[PDB]
Amino acid sequence: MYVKLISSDGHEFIVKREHALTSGTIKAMLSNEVNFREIPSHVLSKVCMYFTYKVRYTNSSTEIPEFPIAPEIALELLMAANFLDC
Amino acid sequence: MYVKLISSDGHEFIVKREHALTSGTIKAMLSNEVNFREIPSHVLSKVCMYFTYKVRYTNSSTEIPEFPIAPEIALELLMAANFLDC
Amino acid sequence: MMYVKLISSDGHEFIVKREHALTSGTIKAMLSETNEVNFREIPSHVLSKVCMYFTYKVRYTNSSTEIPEFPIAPEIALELLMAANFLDC
Amino acid sequence: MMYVKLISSDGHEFIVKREHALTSGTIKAMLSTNEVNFREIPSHVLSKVCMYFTYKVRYTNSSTEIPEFPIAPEIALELLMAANFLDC
Amino acid sequence: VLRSVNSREPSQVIFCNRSPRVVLPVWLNFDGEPQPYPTLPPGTGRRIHSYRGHLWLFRDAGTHDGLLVNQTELFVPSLNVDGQPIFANITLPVYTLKERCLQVVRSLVKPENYRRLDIVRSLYEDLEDHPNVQKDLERLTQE
Amino acid sequence: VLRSVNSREPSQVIFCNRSPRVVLPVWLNFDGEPQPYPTLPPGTGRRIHSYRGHLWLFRDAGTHDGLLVNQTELFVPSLNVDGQPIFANITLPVYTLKERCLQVVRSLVKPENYRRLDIVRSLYEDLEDHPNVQKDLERLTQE
Amino acid sequence: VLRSVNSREPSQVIFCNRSPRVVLPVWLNFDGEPQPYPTLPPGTGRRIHSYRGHLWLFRDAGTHDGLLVNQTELFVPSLNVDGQPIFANITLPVYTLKERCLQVVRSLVKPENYRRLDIVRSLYEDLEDHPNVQKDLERLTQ
Amino acid sequence: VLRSVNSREPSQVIFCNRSPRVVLPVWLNFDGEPQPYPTLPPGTGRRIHSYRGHLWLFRDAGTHDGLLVNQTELFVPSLNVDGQPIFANITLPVYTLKERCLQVVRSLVKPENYRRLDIVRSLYEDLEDHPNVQKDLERLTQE
Amino acid sequence: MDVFLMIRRHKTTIFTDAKESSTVFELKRIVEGILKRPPDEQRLYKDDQLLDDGKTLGECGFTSQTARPQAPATVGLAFRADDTFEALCIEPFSSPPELPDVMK
Amino acid sequence: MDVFLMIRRHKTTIFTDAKESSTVFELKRIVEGILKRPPDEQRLYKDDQLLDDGKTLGECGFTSQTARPQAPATVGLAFRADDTFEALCIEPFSSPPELPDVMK
Amino acid sequence: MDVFLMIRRHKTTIFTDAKESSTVFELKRIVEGILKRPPDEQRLYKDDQLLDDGKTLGECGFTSQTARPQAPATVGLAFRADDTFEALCIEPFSSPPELPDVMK
Amino acid sequence: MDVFLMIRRHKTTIFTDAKESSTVFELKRIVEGILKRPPDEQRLYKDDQLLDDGKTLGECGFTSQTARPQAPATVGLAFRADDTFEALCIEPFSSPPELPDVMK
Ligand SMILES: COc1cc(-c2scnc2C)c(F)cc1[C@H](C)NC(=O)[C@@H]1C[C@@H](O)CN1C(=O)[C@@H](NC(=O)C1(F)CC1)C(C)(C)C
Ligand SMILES: COc1cc(-c2scnc2C)c(F)cc1[C@H](C)NC(=O)[C@@H]1C[C@@H](O)CN1C(=O)[C@@H](NC(=O)C1(F)CC1)C(C)(C)C
Ligand SMILES: COc1cc(-c2scnc2C)c(F)cc1[C@H](C)NC(=O)[C@@H]1C[C@@H](O)CN1C(=O)[C@@H](NC(=O)C1(F)CC1)C(C)(C)C
Ligand SMILES: COc1cc(-c2scnc2C)c(F)cc1[C@H](C)NC(=O)[C@@H]1C[C@@H](O)CN1C(=O)[C@@H](NC(=O)C1(F)CC1)C(C)(C)C
């Protein structure tokens, strides 16, 4: 089962449902599609990568890589992460 | 300020006006003294006690005691209570 | 010392140190504010043992001394268990 | 020396040296009078405040050993609330 | 509509019966159905384990007369701040004199024999209309 | 999860029963399985040989009620500095009044007759839930 | 409360920094005080000497970001069976996206220019609340 | 910003605790990290070896309340002329009454129970802001 | 502590409250306001016992738990006509009917 | 050292502790704080034996090992009713039911 | 070895994982479940290069260390409308603002 | 040498300091400046003991280490009303509430 997350500029990101439920905010908005009128696609894409990163590396004994954040998107990513509580 | 409530058998009960205004029926009859030609004194006295009980125990956090009603007066009290709307 | 009053089902009045009775969160909550609490289903031969348990618990919790057993006569065991189950202490 | 009067909530009158009371900018401002009423601070708290005035004047910028300022546990919460409101 | 939420978050409660009635505790399940729980003798208090967001109401166990909990009709267990259990103070309401009179008569006359009482026909229908938790839920749910 | 490490490093221990119960020492083997050892009468001590990094807990030999060792649940032998053996002080804990009452009743009523006792049913399940080391180890492992 | 026990029983440990951070090892002394030790460059391992029952935590040396050791917050050396040292695998945790964003922003803006950032006031206080070992210990102890 | 200079020049110091507090000496290492040293009981003095250009501050060992050394916040050992050790006099500051009150209350109430005190809410955050060496160092760096 | 009273004379009944600490004379002052009769010509009673103006209601047996709102204690009242005081007369309330069969 | 006591009068039972060295009079002071009756109007008993105010609890037989927290010693209390002191009366606790068969 | 991918067409982006051993055809089957279009009407691209159905993802340059969860590799998707295949067009993501002064 | 004191009468409390060498009379001069009452019409006390005008505070037990700024010594004050002197009476400060539970 997949879910769709639409950015402010209309980009459609399709992610595994379980991955998106990392966000309690997104969980509440689903209870299969969600619109984010304040989060542009260059932020929402990085949010989706974080879901994959978190699901993959949580409780793993392997070496954990840094999660890269370009400085140009750092401020916008912070507010998205703050609103989504993940 | 007090009001006088006269029973069917001529007993005169003097209660605080605001206590008696518990009954909207009584409120309407005042707009000094009121005669209840069908309510005897062994019922109207209990009605007056109920006024005091209601005023004291409405919106109280204390343990509220039962309002006692002897079986012999239960039928007459019910009809008076139904007529007085309290 | 502040004391509180615990009244059993048969009207016996037990007066215990407030700090001792606050071992039980049940009793602490039942006090909040009153100084006395009535236990209408707990008879006096059970409530006396409950008060003793307060003293035993205050005395022996986090003690390195040898702790003695808390005694329960078989005759009161079922009712003490039932009071303890209802008070969850 | 000029003295001032500090009246507690329960009517106790504490008379302290003006220079000592001017430790508190609050008290200095509250004087601009020779008397101030503290209708929220009881005497078992305001008495300690006057002791703090004397303690502060004596031990500010001294190389001698400074003693602890004693606070009984029973008055600790009320003293704290008085101190917070007077910012001293 | 009126129902417990399956929070799965425990809440410990003291059911304090500060009334002279034998109290029936009623828990509204996740479907809103009333479920009876063990009764409490008059003047008794007990620690029971419930959950945050659950709904409880309290009735006379014999007659289903409605009772108050913390001066309201419904009790919802909340977070035990500082580990202290939540207090549910079950008291008699201040009934109307009419309802209180209906109670005494119902306790003295079998429903069989209501029509053998010499009273106005409207009072026959008022008596026979025994307190009912489902109706009371529907009235509260309308508010 | 909880297991002894096979250190092969000796450590001498004094098992000192400072309780009125007959104590059953339980050693957690390398697979984490509880392994019972010889019992100790009340107020008795015995010098035993164990090893550094081994895990031990202590229970009432008849009822399996949990006991404390050096005021905690688990004892691990360490290095014997200056030839002094490690001292393991087995004491009775301060049980809750409920658990203490369950112990007394369990000691007085055969398990087949538990439900023949005039008590609330909830207590039947409480009585039958005898202290169990395997269950407790799984609970600690979940923590 | 959280403190090293003075066991006096030696225990040798391998500090393996499998993180891209310069790691600051912090040993909690017998009074519970954090005590900093020599740093470890990223990807380096060192055999060190400690004692059984001692407490260790691991931090970014430059920013004080918390790190994990054997997938948890605190490390306690245990018995060296067969003389083999205990292995302490110091790794990055999986930060929340918010904390990870706070880190990048702190590394780019001096704390003085924070209140000049166009964000909700809560985020101003979030940035200024730098990782603090004493605070984290109080949080764990609570 | 604040860090010790690796002077490699020995300097002998007399740490003198003229206070009723157990004093914790804190040395800022070359990387600027606070590094705690052995404690000093009230009214005790100890001759220690440090180095010229090193930075030290002094705190209550139990509560981390800041203390004064030579009537200032920071101490830097200097040249020992004629073999005289340098004296570092550790004294109580004259706290504000509010900070002194916060100390007493912090010593009497566990941090978990602050919000159960009947005081203004602003004092809850005041109580929880325990003295912190790292925090105080950041403030000085802002100078 | 509030006490709740029925002050009764002949076919007159006054429902009122007062404090346990209040005195009998102060109770005569309340009766005065309602029936416009001075205390000097008033005599108050607990059953057959005359009550002294100086005594408190609590001392005269009127306590928070015997003089209840839902069940007030009865205080007898007798007035004085010119010279003498009348005897204490309290006309009883009517009698309820016999219990119906369905209630016995 | 610490001894643990039940001070009992009629249906009143006070659970309190004191020191073996502490005196009978100090124990009366505790009774005063709870029940507001001066020591002068109090009589303390061990069995039927009156206790002297000056004697220590240990001398009166209350020792750490007979007056235990889980099994406190009973001290009887009698107050003064105006002119005279009442006789010692300690109401017994309720009795347990007969032991069930399954527990016998 | 797990590989992590962004399958992109126009303004659509699918986050999914696969294995280096899995084939381009198996990746087309995953797209089919999500986007309801058969493999015959799918062409998968890496940059400008079409990918053959039989080739494994590793062979086409998608490896566990270039296609990472925190930085997935992009796979292009172009669909067929009846007769022809559309040209591969991946709409770019939005651009970030210029770095603020306090941050530059 | 410096002593710190609380001169107290009724609900009046004067905080002041002096030297151990200073005399009781010089302390009365300070009371006079504040409260406008001459030394002859005031009596100063240490506890319940009158202090002679000529003796020093040190001789009367007021030392730099018992009369401290953070814990001043109490000196009692009694005035003369016309003919006779009033008795010494010092109103106590308010009492703190009982320790909250979280503080015990
Ligand atoms: C017999 O024992 C009791 C007695 C009493 C009373 S009443 C008057 N005197 C006593 C002594 C009592 F008040 C509660 C209990 C038990 C312990 N307490 C519950 O039954 C709570 C109540 C409600 O909150 C519902 N409930 C669940 O346990 C529910 N379980 C859950 O919701 C979850 F497991 C989280 C998902 C469920 C099993 C009903 C589905
Ligand atoms: C019957 O005799 C005993 C009685 C008692 C008690 S207890 C209460 N009353 C008595 C009298 C006792 F406490 C210990 C012993 C023997 C002497 N002691 C052990 O059994 C120790 C204990 C544990 O530490 C495990 N153990 C091994 O010996 C293990 N062997 C090893 O680990 C190695 F050989 C190093 C590799 C193993 C053989 C079990 C695998
Ligand atoms: C500079 O050398 C080291 C460097 C490093 C690091 S860190 C990153 N790279 C390297 C290479 C290192 F990790 C440890 C050490 C030394 C050898 N190791 C300790 O300092 C251990 C650690 C803790 O366990 C405390 N400790 C004691 O020695 C304590 N002494 C004791 O407890 C006793 F003697 C038993 C009573 C004490 C003296 C501090 C009080
Ligand atoms: C444990 O023994 C002590 C105790 C105490 C205290 S404190 C309260 N009670 C006691 C008993 C004490 F105060 C000092 C010492 C030792 C002897 N003294 C130092 O640790 C000095 C202090 C600082 O100045 C730093 N320091 C270095 O030795 C540094 N080494 C150097 O700077 C050089 F070798 C020149 C390059 C370093 C090794 C830390 C990097």
Of the candidates J21, J70, J73, J69, the residue with the CA atom closest to the CA atom of residue J47: J73
The β-bridge relationship of strands I42-46 and I73-81 is antiparallel
> What is the distance of C-alpha J1 from the center of its chain?
18
Contact K61, K46 (CB under 8 A): yes
Asked whether the beta carbons of B76 and I103 are under 8 A apart, the reply is: no
Task: Give the chain G residue whose CA is nearest to the CA of A75.
Answer: G105
Packing angle between helix B71-84 and helix B41-57, nearest 10 degrees? 70
Q: Calculate the alpha carbon distances from F74 to F22, F66, F71, G2 in Å.
A: 18, 11, 9, 18
Q: How far is the CA of F114 from the centre of ligand 1 (A)?
A: 22
Distance from the CA of F51 to the center of ligand 2, in angstroms?
8
Chain C contact for L104 (CB, 8 A cutoff): yes
Q: Flag if C88 and E84 touch (Cβ within 8 Å).
A: no
Closest C-alpha among F89, F79, F4, F77 to residue F44: F89
Both tokens of residue E11?
Answer: 């809440």
Query: How far is residue K10's CA from residue K4's CA, in Å, rounded to a whole number?
Result: 20
Question: E65 and E42: one domain?
Answer: yes
Q: Is G5 within a domain?
A: no
- Report whether E66 contacts E93 (CB < 8 A): yes
Chain breaks in chain G (C to N over 2.5 A) after: none
Q: In chain D, after which residues does the backbone break, taking C–N over 2.5 angstroms as a break?
A: 32
Q: For residue E28, what are its two tokens? A: 């509204």
Which other chains touch chain I, taking contact as 3+ CB pairs less than 8 Å apart?
A: B, E
Q: Which of K76, K81, K89, K91 is nearest to K38 (CA)?
A: K81
At CA J55, angle to CA J52 and CA J57, rounded to 5?
110
d(CA C79, CA F118): 10
On whether residue E59 sits in a domain, the answer given is yes
Angle between helices G97-108 and A41-57 (to 10 degrees): 120
Is the separation of the CB atoms in C6 and C21 below 8 Å? Answer: yes
Phi (first) and psi of residue L4, to 5 degrees:
-125, 130
Are J78 and J85 in contact, with CB atoms under 8 Å apart? yes
Distance CA A60, CA A54 (A): 10
Domain ranges, residue J92: 2-103
Q: Does E90 touch chain C (CB under 8 A)?
A: no
Amino acid letter, K58: G
**Residue closest to D78 by CA, chosen among C32, L6, L100:** L100
Q: Which of F8, F37, F47 to mutate to test ligand 2, by most ligand atoms within 8 A of the CB atom?
A: F37
Would the CB atoms of A71 and K99 count as touching at under 8 Å? yes
CA angle I77, I79, I81 (to 5 degrees): 170
Q: Which residues are CB-neighbours of C33 under 8 A, at least 6 positions away?
A: none
Beta strands in chain F (DSSP E): 10-18, 23-28, 34-36, 45-51, 55-60, 68-69, 86-91
CB L42 within 8 A of CB L79: yes
Question: What is the CB neighbour count within 10 angstroms for residue H112?
Answer: 12
Report residue L53 as tokens.
Answer: 């005008």
Point out the ligand nearest to the CA of residue H45.
4
CA dihedral K4, K9, K13, K19 (to 10 degrees): -20
Same domain assignment for residues G15 and G85 = yes
| Identity at L8, one-letter amino acid code | R
Question: For residues I73 and I57, is the Cβ–Cβ distance under 8 A?
Answer: no
Which tokens belong to E61? 């166990």
How far, in Å, CA of B34 to CA of B50, rounded?
Answer: 18
- Amino acid identity for residue F63 in this structure: T
CB C54 within 8 A of CB C89: no
Residues with C-beta less than 6 Å from any ligand 4 atom: H 6, 8, 15, 25, 27, 37-38, 40, 46, 48-51, 54
Contact H119, D80 (CB under 8 A): yes
SS3 label, residue G48: strand
User: Number of residue pairs across G and K with CB atoms under 8 Å?
Assistant: 13
Interval between CA E14 and ligand 1 midpoint (Å): 13
For residue I56, the 8-state DSSP code is B
Strands I12-19 and B12-16: parallel
H-helix or E-strand spanning residue H97: helix H97-108
Ligand 3 pocket residue status of G8, Cβ below 6 Å: yes
**Closest CA of chain G from F7, distance in Å:** 5
CB contacts of B69 in chain E (<8 Å) are: 100-101, 104
**Contact state of J102 with F118 under an 8 Å Cβ cutoff:** no
Q: Is the residue at F2 inside a domain?
A: no
CATH at H102:
1.10.750.10
Could you tell me which of I66, F68, B80 has the C-alpha nearest to residue C66? Answer: F68
Bridge partners for G26 per DSSP: G36, G57
- Axis-axis angle for helices G97-108, A71-84 (nearest 10): 150
Is residue B52 within 8 Å of I70, Cβ to Cβ?
A: yes
The residues that bridge with E55 in the sheet, in sequence order, are: E28
Task: Please say whether the dihedral angle defined by the alpha carbons of residues G44, G46, G52 and G55, taken in this order, is positive or negative.
Answer: negative
Q: Which two tokens stand for residue J8?
A: 């009992």
Paired residues of H12 in beta bridges: H49
- Helices H / strands E in chain J, number of each: 1, 6
Instruction: Record the tokens describing residue G19, joined without a space.
Output: 């993180």
Residue C57: is it exposed, middle or buried by C-beta count within 10 angstroms (0-12/13-18/19+)? buried
Are the CB atoms for B61 and E16 separated by under 8 Å?
Answer: no
For residue I74, list its beta bridge partners: I6
Which method, experimentally, gave rise to this model?
X-ray
Q: Which residues contact G136 (CB under 8 A, 6 or more apart)?
A: G66
Token pair in block for residue A83: 């609103």
Interchain CB contact of G106 with A (< 8 Å): no
Q: Which residue of G has its CA nearest to A56?
A: G94
d(CA G50, ligand 4 centre) in Å: 20
Q: Is E54 touching ligand 1 by the criterion CB < 6 Å?
A: yes
Q: Tell the residue number behind the tokens 């604040």, with chain if given.
A: H2
Give dist(CA E62, CA E44) in Å, integer.
Answer: 17
Note whether E61 and E39 are within 8 A (CB). yes
* Total tally of structural domains belonging to chain F: 2
Q: What residue has token string 């040989």? A: F49
> Measuring from atom 18 of ligand 3, which residue has the nearest CA?
G49
Please state whether I71 falls in left (phi above 0), alpha (psi between -120 and 50) or beta: beta
In 3D, which of G128, G116, G137 has the Cα closest to residue H135? G128
Residues in chain K closer than 8 A to G117 (CB atoms):
100, 102-103
C-alpha G6: how far from chain center: 22
E1 within some domain: no
Q: Is residue E27 part of a domain?
A: yes
Burial class (CB in 10 A: 0-12, 13-18, 19+), A77: buried
Q: What is the DSSP string of D64-83?
A: SPPPP----HHHHHHHHHHH
Breaks (C-N over 2.5 A) in chain J follow: none
Question: Residue F79 burial by CB count (10 A; 0-12/13-18/19+): exposed, middle or buried?
Answer: middle
d(CA D18, CA D2): 5
Ligand nearest the Cα of residue E6 is 1
Ligand nearest to the CA of E49: 1
Distance from CA of D65 to the nearest CA of H (A): 6
Long-range Cβ contact pairs of E67-76 (< 8 A, separation 24 or more): E67/E19, E67/E21, E67/E23, E67/E91, E67/E92, E67/E93, E68/E92, E68/E93, E71/B59, E71/B61, E73/E140, E74/E2, E74/E140, E75/E13
Q: Is I15 helix (H, G, I), strand (E, B) or coil?
A: strand
Q: Do F118 and J100 touch (CB under 8 A)?
A: yes
Structural resolution in Å: 2.4
How far apart CA E69 and CA E86 sit, in angstroms, is 12
CATH number of residue J90's parent domain: 3.10.20.90
Tell which E residues from 122 to 141 touch I, by Cβ distance under 8 Å.
none
Beta-bridge partners for C31 = none
Of K72, K75, K94, the C-alpha closest to K35 is K75
In whole angstroms, what is the distance from residue J96 CA to residue C75 CA?
Answer: 6
Provide residues of A within 8 Å CB-CB of chain K. 2, 7-16, 19, 40-42, 45, 48-53, 55-57, 65-68, 70-76
- Angstrom distance (rounded) from CA A37 to CA H4: 52
Q: What is the dihedral of CA A32, A36, A42, A44, to 10 degrees?
A: -50
DSSP lists the bridge partners of residue L73 as: L5
- Give the closest-approach CA distance of E26 to chain I in angstroms: 30
Do C67 and F91 touch, CB atoms closer than 8 A?
yes
- CATH superfamily of domain region B1-86: Potassium Channel Kv1.1; Chain A (3.30.710.10)
| CB-CB neighbors (< 8 A) of G11 in chain F | none
- Shared domain check, H75 and H132: no
E117 vs B: CB within 8 A: yes
Query: In sequence order, which residues have a C-beta less than 8 Å from that of residue L79 and are 6 or more positions away?
Result: L9, L37, L41, L42, L43, L85, L86
E68, C10 Cβ separation under 8 angstroms: no
Same domain, residue pair H111 and H130: yes
Which of K3, K7, K2, K4 lies closest to K28 in space, CA to CA?
Answer: K7
How close does chain D come to L43, measured CA to CA in Å?
Answer: 19
Tell me the C-alpha distance between F96 and C80, whole Å: 12
CB-based contacts of K13: which residues, under 8 Å, 6+ apart?
A11, A12, A13, A14, A45, A48, K6, K7
Chain I residues whose beta carbon lies within 8 Å of the beta carbon of residue B72: 96-99
| Whether F and C touch (3+ CB pairs < 8 Å), yes or no | yes
CB contact set of H123 (below 8 Å; sequence gap of 6+): D80, D81, D84, H117
Strand duo J42-46 + L12-19: pairing: unpaired
Instruction: Tell me which residue of L94, I88, H36, I16 sits closest to D82, measured CA to CA.
Output: L94
Nearest bound ligand to the CA of residue G46: 3
Distance CA J90, CA I100 (A): 49
Residue B67 burial (CB count, 10 A) = 22
Q: Assign a CATH topology to domain D2-88.
A: Potassium Channel Kv1.1; Chain A (3.30.710)
Does E51 sit in the ligand 1 pocket, CB within 6 Å? yes
Question: Counting atoms of ligand 1 from 1, which one is nearest the CA of F121?
Answer: 1
Instruction: Using the mean position of ligand 1's atoms as its centre, give its distance from the Cα of residue E62 in Å.
Output: 22
Distances H52 to H9, H10, H49, J6 between C-alpha atoms, Å? 6, 6, 10, 69
Range J45-65 burial, b when 16+ CB lie within 10 A, else e = bbeeeebeeeeebbebebeee
How far G118 CA sits from the closest chain K CA (Å)? Answer: 9
Compute the distance between CA of residue F131 and CA of residue C65 in angstroms, rounded to an integer.
25
Cβ(E115) – ligand 1 distance below 6 Å: no
Q: How many CB atoms lie within 10 A of CB D28?
A: 12
What count of other Cβ atoms lies within 10 Å of the Cβ of residue E12? Answer: 19
Phi and psi angles of residue E81, each rounded to the nearest 5 degrees, phi first: -65, 135
What is the count of structural domains for chain K?
A: 1
Q: Is G8 exposed, middle or buried (CB count within 10 Å of its CB: 0-12, 13-18, 19+)?
A: exposed
CB-based contact, H31 to chain G, within 8 Å: yes
Residue pair E65/E59 in contact (Cβ under 8 Å)? The answer is: yes
Q: Which domain holds residue E82?
A: 10-91
Look at G105 and A74 and tell me if their CB atoms are within 8 Å.
yes
Closest CA to A14 of K20, K77, K82: K77
**What is the helix (H) or strand (E) element at residue J9, kind and residue range?**
strand J2-9
Does residue I23 contact residue I56 with C-beta atoms inside 8 Å? yes
Give CA angle at A55 (A52, A61), nearest 5°: 120
Nearest-5° Cα angle at K54, K52 to K59: 75
G48 in Cβ contact with G66 (< 8 Å) = no
In single-letter form, the type of residue at position I89 comes to: C
Cα separation, J11 vs C47, in Å, equals: 13
Distance in angstroms (rounded) separating the CA atoms of residues G113 and G120: 15
Domain C2-89 falls in which CATH fold?
Potassium Channel Kv1.1; Chain A (3.30.710)
Do G73 and G17 reside in the same domain of the chain?
Answer: yes
Residue nearest to atom 23 of ligand 2 (CA): F50
Of C39, C40, C88, Cβ closest to residue E47: C88
**CA neighbor of L22 nearest in space, from L50, L59, L47, L71:** L59
Determine contact: K84 vs chain A, CB below 8 A. Answer: no
Computed from CA positions of residues D36, D39, D45, D47, in that sequence, does the dihedral angle turn out positive or negative? positive
How far, in Å, is the centroid of ligand 3 from the Cα of F80? 22
Residue closest via CA to ligand 1's atom 17 equals E49
